[PDB]
């Protein structure tokens, strides 16, 4: 996260660190004790196999993510219509071998419902262990920052992103920059508070650079993916 | 030709209790939670629209069944009656003489309780601050 601040314990209890080869790769969001919402580009080949992956929940610092604290990933499902070239439908699901135990440190975020009636510039939060500067290293501490939604029509302006924002995408941040997600934050949450409930309206997908003016963050539109998410959990629920 | 895609089925074949798509997508997304107050809604094939469920005769095992249908498995948090704020004019009332969840409801323009089901299948969205 660029321009944010370090997160407190329990501030983002759904935030999860996803690891390959003892190294943080991407973020994720807990929605059930077994299921994690992350980005499809994080699980492209060869990392589409679930045995590469380990999830760390309730731990703020990467150095504190010791061997034995992580949860092995049982299943990785990419969105069937994911396009690597356009990052369209950039969403994937991870199921854990062992369900998480929920407490004040580890809690799920609510999947968005239809009819949220969010404001066009709704105030949102992003979090993750991404770089705090463009081309920087993975951050040791979990960070978070406030961003505003940006209407897709404004975001698709020729001066911002020039018709690259699909209906499966939402923009958030500031057109002046200085506050944005970055490398390593991808797959992480874009949440908003409404009716005293935190809703997952987006998963970190892509952007041009980090915190650059007129290049805000682009996030997967979790509302569009809601039907697909429910089907996958249910399909796994009936067993396979 | 009115139709809905299975990626095309006819409207009355969407959410009618019989699977017409190869993967069953016409019968696995017929229940949903609406708005920031989690108003339980059910899709009607006849009116091609979503209608809230009346609180009348609703019990937690009905909400658990709805939670299973949504893919939440055995997760269940709460179910209570609230005033509808989804702007609906037609509702699904529970028929006692029944059968499945979506197949036990019938259309009604009012609820005796004056309340619709607010269903939360999981305790989520709560952090350190309020
Ligand atoms: C309720 O169930 C009874 C008994 O099968 C049936 O006669 C009736 O049509 C059902 N629905 C309505 C609209 O009352
Ligand atoms: C993921 O690591 C990721 C997501 C988004 C961006 N770009 C911007 N937020 N500008 C970079 C990296
Ligand atoms: Ca059908």
Numbering used by the authors:
A (entry chain C): 256 to 495
B (entry chain A): 115 to 121, 126 to 216, 219 to 250
What does the paper say about this structure?
Host proteases, TMPRSS2 and CTSL/CTSB cleave the SARS-CoV-2 spike to play a crucial role in the two alternative pathways of viral entry and are characterized as promising pharmacological targets. The entry of SARS-CoV-2 depends on two distinctive pathways, cell surface entry and endosomal entry, where the transmembrane serine protease, TMPRSS2, and endosomal cysteine proteases cathepsin L/B (CTSL/CTSB) cleave the viral spike protein. The crystal structures of TMPRSS2 and CTSL/CTSB in complex with the potent inhibitors were determined to reveal their specific mode of interaction.
Nafamostat and camostat, two clinically available drugs used to treat pancreatitis, displayed excellent inhibitory potency with IC50 values of 0.40 nM and 9.00 nM, respectively. The crystal structures of TMPRSS2 in complex with nafamostat, camostat, and UK-371804, were determined to 2.6 Å, 2.4 Å and 2.6 Å, respectively. We use the structure of TMPRSS2 in complex with camostat as the representative to describe the overall structure of TMPRSS2. There are two polypeptides in the asymmetric unit with the root-mean-square deviation (r.m.s.d) of 1.44 Å over 378 Cα atoms, indicating the two protomers are similar. The ester group in their common guanidinobenzoyl moiety then reacts with the catalytic serine of TMPRSS2 to form the acyl-enzyme intermediate and cleave off the “leaving group”. Our structures of TMPRSS2 in complex with nafamostat and camostat both capture the post-reaction state, leaving the identical remnant moiety in the catalytic site of the SP domain. Apart from the ester bond formed with γO of the catalytic serine, the guanidyl head of the guanidinobenzoyl moiety forms a salt bridge with Asp435, and is further anchored by hydrogen bonds with Ser436 and Gly464 in the S1 pocket.
